[PDB]
């Protein structure tokens, strides 16, 4: 609908990142405070590589229309490009799950899981590879709806290939990465499935600080290991079928879903459509 910088009133900071930054604003063109509250994503330090990446990210979100995918509202130019999205009042599923640990049961976690699978299958249909599935990137609309909230690392597959090779300079979410993503930089629907199992793990730990994928893996590798060595030993751990433990209270049938996503053989990993059916079958049994 095109947003004018002069009417985007800053309210607060919703989140930070190395390349991104998200603010809570009020788009009030009438200056009568009847304007809608929106989320604004801006580049922390704008370069030409980050800018071109951001324009590719804006087109990715503009092209996505799904109930479990954050709504795109528009852009805000000067040059200093800003992505306008809908405001989701409850924030990340990461922070929400901690605050309502006591209030969110396994049945409800499976509702969220199911929704994540639906949104992820929608992405696959468009040949988009998320490359950063983590509960931190899932946003809460209300108690009964979560949406995939960021697409900063999302890449479109080549027409001819089923993977995409990319080595982005800087810090990667290595503890959510499939082995082939760590060793060969190959990103596919199957590496997204691996990362999904880490999301499902995250949920069932209720984001307990000590139980996080980095903390659990660093414990397995050794807290003495530093720098480029962490990636090396993680590769070796995953190769020797070293895996995240079953979260406390997690039923064996949910942990099985996790371990199946964490297959070293890319081809024997489940599909998002099969993951959805299983999660829904388990939900229906619990109900
Ligand atoms: N689209 C959105 O509405 C939205 C988007 C992001 C986001 C997306 C991508 C990236 Cl890369 C980042 Cl960093 C952030 C974060 C939040 C969104 N709504 C929120 C409501 C509340 C909070 C929150 O926890 N707060 C702020 C209020 O005080 C308590 C602590 C955070 C968010």
Structure method: X-ray
> In this structure, are residues 189 and 129 in contact, taking their beta carbons and an 8 Å threshold?
yes
CA distance 55 to 62: 10
Q: Which residues contact 256 (CB under 8 A, 6 or more apart)?
A: none
Does the C-beta of 134 come closer than 6 Å to ligand 1?
no
Task: Tell me which architecture the domain covering 1-87 has in CATH.
Answer: 2-Layer Sandwich (3.30)
Question: Which residue do the tokens 């993977």 mark?
Answer: 163
Give SS3 for 66: coil
Does the C-beta of 91 come closer than 6 Å to ligand 1?
yes
- DSSP secondary structure letters along 148-192: E---TT-EEPPTT-S-EE---SS---TTT--HHHHHS-EE-HHHH
Angle at alpha carbon of residue 17, lines to 15 and 21, rounded to 5°: 50
Is 132 a catalytic site residue? yes
Mutation test residue for ligand 1: of 10, 17, 20, 22, the one with most atoms within 8 Å of CB? 22
Nearest CA to ligand 1 atom 18: 91
What is the number of the ligand 1 atom nearest to the C-alpha of 21?
Answer: 13
CA distance 14 to 192: 25
Give burial (CB, 10 Å; 0-12/13-18/19+) of 6: exposed
Which residues does residue 146 pair with via DSSP β-bridges, in sequence order?
A: 140
CA distance 287 to 282: 9
Among 3.20.20.70, 1.10.510.10, 1.10.10.10, 3.40.50.720, name the CATH number for the domain at 88-284.
Answer: 1.10.510.10
Q: List residues forming the annotated binding site.
A: 14-22, 41
Give Cα separations from 161 to 181, 185, 186, 265 (angstroms). 16, 14, 11, 18
Does the C-beta of 97 come closer than 6 Å to ligand 1?
no
Ramachandran angles phi, psi of 34, nearest 5°: -115, -5
Q: How far is the CA of 132 from the centre of ligand 1 (A)?
A: 16
Domain ranges of the chain: 1-87, 88-284
Element (H, E) at 119: helix 106-125
> In this structure, are residues 254 and 218 in contact, taking their beta carbons and an 8 Å threshold?
no
End-to-end CA distance of the chain: 43
How distant is the alpha carbon of residue 45 from its chain centre? 22
Extract the tokens encoding 267: 């081809």
Output the CA torsion 201→203→208→213 (10° steps).
30
Does the C-beta of 57 come closer than 6 Å to ligand 1?
no
Identical fold for domains 1-87 and 88-284, yes or no, is no
């Amino acid at each position: 609908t095109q947003f004018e910088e002069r009417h985007l009133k800053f309210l607060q900071q919703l989140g930070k990142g190395n390349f991104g930054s998200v603010e809570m604003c009020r788009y009030d063109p009438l200056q009568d405070n009847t304007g809608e509250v929106v989320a604004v994503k801006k580049l922390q330090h704008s370069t030409e590589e980050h800018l071109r990446d951001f324009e590719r990210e804006i087109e990715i979100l503009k092209s996505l229309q799904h109930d479990n995918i954050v709504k795109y509202k528009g852009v805000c130019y000067s040059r200093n490009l800003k992505l306008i999205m809908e405001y989701l009042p409850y924030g990340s599923l990461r922070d929400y799950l901690q605050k309502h640990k006591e209030r969110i049961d396994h049945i409800k976690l499976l509702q969220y899981t199911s929704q994540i699978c639906k949104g992820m299958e929608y992405l696959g249909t468009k040949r988009y590879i998320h490359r950063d599935l983590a509960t931190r990137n899932i946003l809460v609309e209300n108690e009964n709806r979560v949406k995939i909230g960021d697409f900063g690392l999302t890449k479109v597959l080549p027409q001819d290939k089923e993977y995409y090779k990319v080595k982005e300079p800087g810090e990667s979410p290595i503890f959510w990465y499939a082995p082939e993503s760590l060793t060969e930089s190959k990103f596919s629907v199957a590496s997204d499935v691996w990362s999904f199992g880490v999301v499902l793990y995250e949920l069932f730990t209720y984001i307990e600080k000590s139980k996080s994928p980095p903390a659990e893996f660093m414990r397995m590798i050794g807290n003495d290991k530093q720098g480029q060595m962490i990636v090396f030993h993680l590769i070796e751990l995953l190769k020797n079928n070293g895996r995240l433990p079953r979260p406390d209270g997690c039923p064996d049938e949910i942990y099985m879903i996790m371990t199946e996503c964490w297959n070293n053989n890319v081809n024997q990993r489940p599909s998002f459509r099969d993951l959805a059916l299983r999660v829904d079958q388990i939900r229906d049994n619990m109900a």
